[PDB]
Structures are given as structure tokens and as C-alpha cells.
Amino acid sequence: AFIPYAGAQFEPEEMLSKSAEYYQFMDHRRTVREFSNRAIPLEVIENIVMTASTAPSGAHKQPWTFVVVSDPQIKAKIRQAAEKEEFESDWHKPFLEIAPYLIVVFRKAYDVLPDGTQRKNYYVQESVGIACGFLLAAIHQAGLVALTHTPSPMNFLQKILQRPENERPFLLVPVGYPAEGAMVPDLQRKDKAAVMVVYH
Amino acid sequence: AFIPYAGAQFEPEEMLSKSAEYYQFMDHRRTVREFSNRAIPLEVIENIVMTASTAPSGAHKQPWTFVVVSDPQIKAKIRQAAEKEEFESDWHKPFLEIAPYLIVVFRKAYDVLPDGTQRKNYYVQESVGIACGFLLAAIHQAGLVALTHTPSPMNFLQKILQRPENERPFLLVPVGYPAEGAMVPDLQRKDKAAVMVVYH
Ligand SMILES: Cc1cc2nc3c(=O)[nH]c(=O)nc-3n(C[C@H](O)[C@H](O)[C@H](O)COP(=O)(O)O)c2cc1C
Ligand SMILES: Cc1cc2nc3c(=O)[nH]c(=O)nc-3n(C[C@H](O)[C@H](O)[C@H](O)COP(=O)(O)O)c2cc1C
Ligand SMILES: Oc1ccccc1I
Ligand SMILES: Oc1ccccc1I
């Protein structure tokens, strides 16, 4: 069954101002590595996660699980293992505990029917990446900051968060208010000519 | 060098209302497959693409190229090849020509220094996926619709858009106004319990 698209549309003059304003808003987003431990309602994080989940996906499978962690002992154990692994191979990661939430994104390679059998999901890495994009935009929209982080150590995260075999950690995202006078590196984003090619 | 983070922050009551409102906005987004050929200023698409490019990336490499195509003969040739390939293995794809723009996202596996040598990029599939997420959010923000589409035929796209070896097509995104009375399938997104797990 099909239903008519319910979408607001605008004149070109309004799309110009909205697209320009949104670009400027998003350009202020920076990865932050120093957090305040100021409390945030769980309802804010739920809104953000379910926004990420509105992302398109291959064959509408939504092949993702978002694990939200605010429990301080699980955060401490994840920090310990993260630090240990990065040492062996800065490796100081207090943000894994100071941030009030960790969002751990898992990808689902297949689904398991209630009858044991498996069904492949489609374009999973792309789909889940897109959803992480929506996650980060929603975080920014809410007035929070985040640290996009490698999902490591991968096996430890899978075990302590008790996720099944059809899933694997994809990204790790501390979220919170920034620390007062948090600093970021003075980076410059690529200009239009270095990222964009236009045919006519 | 480092510089202080310049970010607006809000009280919990305001983050609640903003995160809730943004969720509702984003939940209206739907993949649309029937476009109007109403004209859109190139400046809108540029704003959208450069918004996508504000995405975080592994080691700040921004390992992506956005190819914007409005040229009707290139669009016709891409349509022809897309349709041909999907036939052999609906396969009617008029959107590839009716949409005023196609954005073709390429991922960069490595960079090529001006001196011939190569340097690996890091977490490319994740980084580019995130950027595609920002792309789609910016499209929605502007009041447009899009069709997130497999990058196929992969080789044809690489050739007709003349991209170098360190790059590969990642996603194909028609963008425009929706057709009047465009229809979407009557799908339901997963509920919180099917996508989200909370520890304390
Ligand atoms: C897939 C991915 C993985 C990342 N992993 C880490 C990480 O492990 N540690 C870290 O400090 N930053 C990590 N980052 C953040 C980048 O270093 C950061 O995005 C980049 O320096 C650009 O800064 P910006 O996001 O403020 O523009 C990651 C980013 C992405 C997209
Ligand atoms: C990685 C990816 C690839 C997709 N490829 C196609 C495609 O090739 N053809 C198509 O008609 N839709 C494609 N889609 C769109 C999905 O079918 C659509 O997102 C899904 O049915 C959910 O609909 P919604 O985005 O309106 O929520 C793709 C989506 C993603 C994320
Ligand atoms: O999501 C999709 C819809 C139609 C054909 C392929 C995919 I993946
Ligand atoms: O982007 C990064 C920053 C620090 C360490 C690894 C990555 I990938």
C-alpha cells in the first residue's frame, strides 16, 4: 500500500536562506574531547537516538542497534579496556567516564527470524553510517557535543553490552555538554573546489 | 594549535523541546521516487553539499568527493546504463533524468601527494557514510526530497564522471522537489524497544 507524501515545500528564495543558515549552523559543529559531567535528561538522548533511526536504510531493514550507556561502572570498564588496548599497540580517555552518556552503535549484518533462519540485510555499512550522520546532527541540534570514536576494543564492547552474533560495534559516541573553556584544534575544512565537482 | 570551542548551549528544558521538535521534523522525511523537474538554484545544492562536508572524518582527511550533475546528456547516459544493468540481472528509472540534480558521492581510499606517493585515509566507509547522513539532513532542511540509491553501474559512473583511481562511487542521490501527489509506501519505522537498549 501507498500513501501521499506529506512534505512542506518552499520557494527558491526561502530554500536559499534556509540552506545557507543550516550550513552556517552545522559549520560550528566541532568534535569535542573534554566534557562536563552536567546531567542530561534521558528523554533528550532518546529523542536523538530515535532521530538517528529515521534514517533511510537498504530495503527498510534499519540494520542497527543503539546501546545507550549511562551506568558509571560499565563506563569505567569500557574506559579501562579502551585505554589498555591503545597503550599496548593520547591513551588517556577520561571522556569515556565523564560524558554522561556513551552511545554505542552496532551494525546488523543479518536478521534472525524467530524460527532460527537468517535473512541478509542490504548496504549495512552505508545505512548505519547514514544513521550515525543523523545522530550527530541531532546532537548538535540539541545543543550538545560529541566525540566520534573508533569502536574499540571491539570484542570487549560486544561482550560487556551483551549483543548477539549478527551484530558488531560500528562507532562509539560520548555525548554531553562541553567542559567550560573546552579547546579544539585549529583545523580548516576543505574548500568547495577540493570536495565538489559540478557538471554544468 | 588550539582554540576555544564556540558553541551555544541550552538549559535541559530547551534541549527537551529542541530534540523533540527535531525528531518530529526528521520523522516526516521519506524517500521519494517521483520528482518534479522544477528548477533549483545551484547555490542551494552547493550549500547542501558543503554542509555534508562539515562532517567529522578519520584523521580529518574528509575522504570524499561530491559530483553534482545537472547536465541532461550525462544524466540521460547514466539513466540508460543504470536501467540496462538492473534489467540483465522496477528497472524504469526516469528520476535519474527528471530530478534536476544528481549528487554522486565518491569515497577516497587514499590521498595522492603531489609527489606521486600515497597516504592511507582512515575509517573511510564510516566517515563518508556520516557525511551522506549530513547531506540527507541538509536536503530535508532545505525543503527538498531525495532518493538514496545504490551507486550503479559502478564502473560507468567512475568513467563518465572522470574520477581517479583512489576514488570509488559510494552512493547516488537524485535531489529535487517532489512530484505533485507523489506517493510513498506505507511503512512503519521500528519502535524504541526494537532499536535501542539502555543501561541504567
Ligand atoms: C569514523 C570516525 C572515527 C573517528 N575516530 C576518532 C578517534 O578514534 N579518536 C578521536 O580522538 N577522534 C576520532 N574521530 C574524530 C576526528 O578526529 C575529527 O572528526 C576530525 O579531527 C575533524 O574534526 P571535527 O569533527 O571537529 O571537524 C573520528 C571521526 C570519524 C568520522
Ligand atoms: C544505502 C541505501 C541504499 C539504498 N538504495 C536504494 C535503491 O537502490 N533503490 C531504491 O528505490 N531505494 C533505495 N534506498 C531507499 C530505501 O528503500 C528506503 O530508504 C527505505 O525503503 C525506507 O524508506 P524511507 O527512507 O522513506 O524511510 C536505499 C537506502 C539506503 C540507505
Ligand atoms: O532499498 C532498496 C530498494 C530497492 C532496491 C534495492 C534496495 I538496497
Ligand atoms: O581521527 C582520529 C583521531 C585520533 C586517533 C584516531 C583517529 I581515526
From Swiss-Prot, chains A, B:
FMN binds at residues 29-33, 56-57, 148-150, 189. Its EC number is 1.21.1.1. SUPFAM superfamilies: FMN-dependent nitroreductase-like. Belongs to the nitroreductase family. The gene is IYD. It catalyses: 2 iodide + L-tyrosine + 2 NADP(+) = 3,5-diiodo-L-tyrosine + 2 NADPH + H(+); iodide + L-tyrosine + NADP(+) = 3-iodo-L-tyrosine + NADPH; 3-iodo-L-tyrosine + iodide + NADP(+) = 3,5-diiodo-L-tyrosine + NADPH + H(+); L-tyrosine + chloride + NADP(+) = 3-chloro-L-tyrosine + NADPH. It comes from the Bacteria. Gene3D superfamilies: NADH Oxidase (3.40.109.10). Homodimer. This is Iodotyrosine deiodinase. Catalyzes the dehalogenation of halotyrosines such as 3-iodo-L-tyrosine and 3,5-diiodo-L-tyrosine. Likely to also catalyze the dehalogenation of other halotyrosines such as 3-bromo-L-tyrosine, 3-chloro-L-tyrosine and 3-iodo-L-tyrosine. Activity towards 3-iodo-L-tyrosine is much stronger than activity towards 3,5-diiodo-L-tyrosine and 2-iodophenol. GO terms for molecular function: FMN binding; iodotyrosine deiodinase activity. Its cofactor is FMN. It comes from Haliscomenobacter hydrossis (strain ATCC 27775 / DSM 1100 / LMG 10767 / O). It is an enzyme of class 1 (oxidoreductase). Keywords: Flavoprotein, FMN, NADP, Nucleotide-binding, Oxidoreductase. 3-iodo-L-tyrosine binds at residues 86, 93.
